[PDB]
A paper describes a structure:
We present structures of two 10-mer bound structures of inactive PCV2Y96F (1.93 Å resolution) and WDVY106F (1.80 Å resolution), and one 8-mer bound WDVY106F (2.61 Å resolution) structure. The pre-cleavage state was captured by mutating the catalytic tyrosine to phenylalanine. All three structures are in complex with the divalent cofactor manganese. Additionally, the catalytic tyrosine (though a Phe mutant in the structures) is positioned for nucleophilic attack of the scissile phosphate, where the active oxygen of PCV2 and WDV is measured at 2.2 and 2.9 Å from the phosphate, respectively. The U-shaped DNA sits in a shallow channel on the surface of one face of the [name] protein with a distinct topological ‘nose’ that juts out in the center of the U. The bent conformation of the [name] in the [name] structures is driven by both intermolecular interactions with the topological ‘nose’ of the protein and by intramolecular Watson–Crick base pairing between T−4 and A+1 along with adjacent hydrogen bonding between N3 of T−1 and N3 of A−3. In the WDVY106F + 10-mer structure, residues His91 and Asp93 in this ‘bridging’ motif specifically contact the base of A−5, whereas Arg79 and His81 in the PCV2 structure contact the base of G−5. We hypothesize that these contacts play a major role in conferring specificity differences at the −5 position. His91 and Asn93 of WDV facilitate polar contacts with A−5, which may give WDV more specificity at position –5, whereas there is only one polar contact with G−5 by His82 in the PCV2 structure, which results in less stringent specificity.
Replication initiator proteins (Reps) from the [name]-endonuclease superfamily process specific single-stranded DNA ([name]) sequences to initiate rolling circle/hairpin replication in viruses, such as crop ravaging geminiviruses and human disease causing parvoviruses. To uncover the [name] recognition mechanism of Reps and identify potential motifs that might confer sequence specificity, we solved the first high resolution crystal structures of two [name] nickase domains from Porcine circovirus 2 (PCV2) and [name] (WDV) with 12% sequence identity, bound to [name] encoding minimal sequences comprising the respective origin of replication (ori) sequences. With this, we term this turn-β-turn structural motif as the ‘single-stranded DNA Bridging Motif’ (sDBM), and suggest that it is the main binding moiety responsible for recognition and conformation priming of [name] by [name] [name]-endonucleases.
Residue numbers in the entry: 8 to 126
Write the structure that this text describes.
DNA sequence: TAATATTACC
């Protein structure tokens, strides 16, 4: 059993090179039932570590995630890997956003959509 | 928490 019920989600996809814009657009539709209001997606590359993606999602309605694989994403080129995330309820949207945007290596590895919600 | 995995607010 896996359950998280929150308007605010913090996702981390380890060992994942997905372009942030395409991950964002895909999570917008997977979460469309909860009316996403803001999403930030960041692809983190750094010389001595594994590449990964973080996503912050702020929804209008409380998301009900009861399947741990509900936000899995598949890349559209060989080897067609499936990326499974760590899913969490965000304790502090401002701290999550600061953490993931301060880690990034360049502004080209960040994607944003919507208006940031002052929680 | 599962289920990716060393990556995941603090
Ligand atoms: Mn990171
Ligand atoms: Mn586990
Ligand atoms: Mn493992
Ligand atoms: Mn952890």
């Amino acid at each position: 059993r896996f359950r998280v019920y929150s308007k605010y989600l913090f996702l981390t996809y380890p060992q994942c090179t997905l372009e942030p814009q395409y991950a964002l657009d895909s999570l917008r539709t997977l979460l469309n039932k909860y009316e996403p209001l803001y999403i930030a997606a960041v692809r983190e590359l750094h010389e001595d570590g594994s590449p990964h993606l973080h996503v912050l999602v702020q929804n209008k309605l409380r998301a009900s995630i009861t399947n741990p694989n509900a936000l899995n994403l598949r890349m559209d080129t060989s080897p067609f890997s499936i990326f499974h995330p760590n899913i969490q309820a965000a304790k502090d949207c401002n701290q999550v956003r600061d953490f993931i945007t301060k880690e990034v290596d360049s502004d080209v590895n960040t994607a944003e959509w919507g208006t940031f919600v002052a929680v």
